[PDB]
């Protein structure tokens, strides 16, 4: 039988559809939150004092 072939365009379209997935968007946000948490710990360690209201 004739061999199936995914065009470069089909691959981009399938991937953009995947990026639109709620689970996949949620994991991106989760990753950003983990970098913000890491940065928060480093910011605090670099400080002499914290002033709060």
């Amino acid at each position: 039988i004739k061999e199936l072939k995914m065009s470069k365009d089909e691959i981009k379209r399938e991937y953009k559809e995947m990026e639109g997935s709620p689970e996949i968007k949620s994991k991106r946000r989760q990753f950003h939150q983990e970098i913000q948490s890491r940065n928060m710990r480093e910011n605090v360690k670099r400080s002499s004092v914290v002033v709060a209201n």
């Binding site: 948490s37 928060m40 710990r41 910011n43 605090v44 360690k45 670099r46 400080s47 002499s48 004092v49 914290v50 002033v51 709060a52 209201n53």
Partner: protein, 87 residues
């Protein structure tokens, strides 16, 4: 904001003037509080100064002149607590 937490760095002979290290508001303030307790970084309630630094202060810049007098009191308090804790 409702809640404010602002980090200040000042080490004599290292920083010529005090530096703003972070600015957090609201939900992030309880997290900042936990990490500061865990890391042994003092957290002081100074409502006028925290409110003033919220408006004017820029992260990784020096404390602005408009807040240096109020900041110097906090820094002199922190130095007194440090020297006294050594006893």
């Amino acid at each position: 904001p409702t809640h404010i937490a602002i980090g200040i760095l000042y080490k004599r002979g290292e920083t010529p003037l005090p530096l703003v290290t972070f600015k957090y508001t609201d939900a992030q303030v309880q997290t900042v509080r936990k990490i500061a307790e865990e890391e042994g970084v003092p957290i002081l309630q100074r409502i006028p100064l925290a409110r003033a630094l919220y408006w004017d202060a820029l992260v990784d810049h020096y404390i602005p002149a408009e807040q240096i007098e109020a900041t110097a009191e906090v820094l002199r308090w922190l130095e007194r607590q440090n020297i006294e804790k050594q006893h």
